[PDB]
């Protein structure tokens, strides 16, 4: 297992690798855990042009 940083966004996840049995192959997983939250829904907004009829 290794640390694995996503560029641009400021997040760090894991990069894990395991090997199969009796064969030259393996599995690789790039996992990363996050949850997006809106603490002030009244502060966010939306713009909707052309909302006629």
């Amino acid at each position: 297992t290794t640390s694995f940083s996503i560029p641009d966004v400021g997040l760090n996840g894991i990069f894990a690798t395991q090997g199969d049995i009796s064969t030259l192959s393996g599995l690789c997983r790039i996992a990363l855990w996050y949850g997006v939250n809106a603490t002030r829904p009244e502060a966010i907004g939306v713009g909707l042009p052309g909302q006629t009829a």
């Binding site: 090997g19 009796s22 064969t23 030259l24 393996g26």
Partner: protein
């Protein structure tokens, strides 16, 4: 092809032997034909040793469908001659007969040709032993820590 049934194979074998054909005035008994079909089935099962012998595509009849004769043998176009030549050679002793030299040679040639393709397919080389290194010229394997062959 005009030989599409086990009974057709038996009739061809008998014609090759000279015992019965479509031109003779005396024909063999249906009991004799059934015995020849039993021989053909037994010989084919002996050849096809539960899938680990001479693969030919022959289809083994079941007892639910009553008559073995009348079933398609399923052989490819290039197996019929070998099959019925060997069958004639095998059923020759039934009639105090002896298959001729041409029939025997053709049976041998046909059996060899039948097994040729299966032998070519089966001539497969075993994998590397479990103790052989993969060498450092295999860059990705060396980096990813597959330093020895798996084997098996």
């Amino acid at each position: 092809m005009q030989i599409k049934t086990k009974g057709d194979l038996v009739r061809a074998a008998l014609r090759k032997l000279g015992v019965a054909s479509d031109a003779t005035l005396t024909d063999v008994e249906p009991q004799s034909m059934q015995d020849a079909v039993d021989d053909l089935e037994a010989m084919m099962a002996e050849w096809y040793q539960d899938g680990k012998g001479i693969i030919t595509g022959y289809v083994f009849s079941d007892d639910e469908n009553p008559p073995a004769e009348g079933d398609d043998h399923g052989l490819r176009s290039s197996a019929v001659s070998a099959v019925f030549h060997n069958l004639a050679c095998r059923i020759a002793p039934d009639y105090a007969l002896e298959a001729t030299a041409k029939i025997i040679a053709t049976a041998k040639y046909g059996k060899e040709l039948l097994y040729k393709q299966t032998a070519i397919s089966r001539a497969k080389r075993a994998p590397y032993p479990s103790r052989m290194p993969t060498g450092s010229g295999n860059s990705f394997a060396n980096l990813n820590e597959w330093h020895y062959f798996p084997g098996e």
